[PDB]
Write a protein that binds this DNA or RNA. Structure first.
Ligand SMILES: C[C@H]1O[C@H](O[C@H]2[C@H](O)[C@@H](O)[C@@H](O)[C@H](O)[C@@H]2O)[C@@H](N)C[C@@H]1NC(=N)C(=O)O
Lengths: 88, 73, 119, 101
RNA sequence: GUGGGAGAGGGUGGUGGAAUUCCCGGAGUAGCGGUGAAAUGCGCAGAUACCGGGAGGAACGCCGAUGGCGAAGGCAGCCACCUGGUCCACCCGUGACGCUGAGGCGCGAAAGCGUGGGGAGCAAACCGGAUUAGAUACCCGGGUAGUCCACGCCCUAAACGAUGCGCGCUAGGUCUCUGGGUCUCCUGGGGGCCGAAGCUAACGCGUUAAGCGCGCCGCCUGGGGAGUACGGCCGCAAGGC
């Protein structure tokens, strides 16, 4: 599982500033985190379809905020993706 | 009527999750391995449900039975 | 021709015939009776009477082996199980204890049509 | 790592030696998987509700270890290897949920 | 985001006890089994009933609800690991980042198809028993596929609340599951029944709306002929759309 530490780090890591626990980029990060872990969990248990829905959802939720990130500020988008290695 | 008494009422405080207090769980069993129904246990929706697993756990650890022959009939 | 005195008597009820078996204080049957052992040829074997007889009969043969005490065991439900018990009670052997051990699956084999349609 | 409770039940006809022999293997094999003991309780002989492995009694070993979860499913395999060890059951330590209090 | 919680939500490995069948040994007879009656069958190579031992598959009583969870199909022995959804509290962070959703992609009960494995019980087909005017049934005894596992395919259904998703508004009473509080009661989410206004062809619906409204998709436009024909697409096939 994801551990507070493992988590908070990711936060602090992206947080647009001190105390920020919500900035899109944060959000996006954390997601991506879960996503990946999930994905991982799906590289096996390939028959755990249910979880994958969740995944699918996350993937979606993620790609939403992003599309919003651009619209509002293109830079913070490029900057973010690149830093998360999203796309592919 | 099932108005004999509730195993709970005629008992002290006990951790429902301690799958070893065989001197207590024992109470929650019928004159057979069987698990007394809420009407008896006296427990609650959440309780009875826990006391449920525990009596299963202990069963495995050869502590509590799964069934006891009936005496009379 | 063995002398047993104390022993166990199994009672096996059914909707098609009741059958008794008397064993040594450890499961090894001494004498055994059913409804068929008696006269009755079919449906009849069910009845508490058919059962009763079936009981006394086996209580009888048992005596000859000195049988005196018996612990009652009963498996199943059916046409006159009770009569059998009451039969053995007054049959003459002293009734130590009556006890039911009827088999009940904690859900194993799919019963056959004839018995399905429940849950 | 998570806090657990290793329940072990083995043959009740083991002479003083044999017993402490198994006990060792346990105490040992445990270490192998990170098993850091926090305490134990020895109840030993207790009549079983039912006969386990023909024998109507069992010796009881209860450990409240603390180890790497990704290896808990193994810690048991090993314990289960003991021909005297007739029962193994590890549980996650859960605060006691009281009742009738 | 922080902190609490409940659950048969999913996946993998593991593992307990009951019962059935089979095998072995012990002991023991003459029947057992089955039905409305019966017969087919099983038994003196000794069945049944009984004790002990062993093997194997399937399922997992009681708890279990009038309950819970899931988007649906669906999910309950116990244990652990891996994982989805969710509610409540704090009101902390972002700042409208939202709803719907043609086609697509994914999931999708039962049966059924391919290869392999498995095979206790059940049991289409089929084999006998009986019933009857007959009985290619209903009842009885067997019995193959199959039903269980793996990978793959099929993808339909009274796949039903027969009631698309999302948001706001409109008396309450009571039962219940679950979270928070100053916890004989207030407060949040869920499941039921009764029921205001209102709706309804009526039955019924009724803050779990079939009410008052907004957005967005799906679908209907007489019965039979037909879910047929033609065509296209899919499918190993059965077939499906
Ligand atoms: C003997 C009868 O068996 C069947 O009828 C049975 C009826 O006669 C009674 O025994 C009960 O109601 C049963 O439940 C019925 O099944 C049915 N097969 C008709 C038969 N009639 C005769 N055999 C006759 O009249 O002679």
């Amino acid at each position: 599982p994801i551990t507070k530490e493992e988590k908070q780090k990711v936060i602090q890591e992206f947080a647009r500033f001190p105390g920020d626990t919500g900035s899109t980029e944060v959000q996006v990060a954390l997601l991506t985190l879960r996503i990946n872990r999930l994905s991982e969990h799906l590289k096996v248990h390939k028959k755990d379809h249910h979880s994958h829905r969740g995944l699918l959802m996350m993937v979606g939720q993620r790609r939403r905020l992003l599309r919003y990130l651009q619209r509002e500020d293109p830079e913070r988008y490029r900057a973010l993706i690149e830093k998360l290695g999203i796309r592919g | 009527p099932s108005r004999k008494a509730k195993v709970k009422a005629t008992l002290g405080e006990f951790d429902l999750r301690d799958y070893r207090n065989v001197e207590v769980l024992k109470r929650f069993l019928s004159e057979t391995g069987k698990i007394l129904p809420r009407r008896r246990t006296g427990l609650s929706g959440k309780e009875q449900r826990i006391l449920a697993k525990t009596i299963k756990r202990a069963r495995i650890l050869g502590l509590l039975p799964f069934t006891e022959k009936l005496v009379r009939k | 021709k063995r002398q047993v005195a104390s022993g166990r008597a199994y009672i096996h009820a059914s909707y098609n015939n009741t059958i008794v078996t008397i064993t040594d204080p450890d499961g090894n049957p001494i004498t055994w009776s059913s409804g068929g052992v008696i006269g009755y040829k079919g449906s009849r074997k069910g009845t508490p009477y058919a059962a009763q007889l079936a009981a006394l009969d086996a209580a009888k043969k048992a005596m000859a082996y000195g049988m005196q005490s018996v612990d009652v065991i009963v498996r199943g439900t059916g046409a006159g199980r009770e009569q059998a018990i009451r039969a053995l009670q007054a049959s003459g052997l002293q009734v130590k204890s009556i006890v039911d051990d009827t088999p009940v699956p904690h859900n194993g084999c799919r019963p056959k049509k004839k018995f399905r349609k429940a849950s | 790592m998570r806090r657990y409770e290793v329940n072990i039940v083995l043959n009740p006809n083991l002479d003083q030696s044999q017993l402490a022999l198994e006990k060792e293997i346990i105490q040992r094999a445990l270490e192998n998987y990170g098993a850091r003991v926090e305490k134990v309780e020895e109840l030993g002989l207790r009549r079983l509700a039912y006969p386990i492995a023909k024998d109507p009694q069992g010796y009881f070993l209860w450990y409240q270890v603390e180890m790497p979860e990704d290896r808990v499913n193994d810690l048991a395999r090993e314990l289960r290897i003991r021909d005297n060890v007739r029962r193994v059951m590890v549980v996650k330590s859960q605060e006691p949920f009281l009742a009738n209090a």
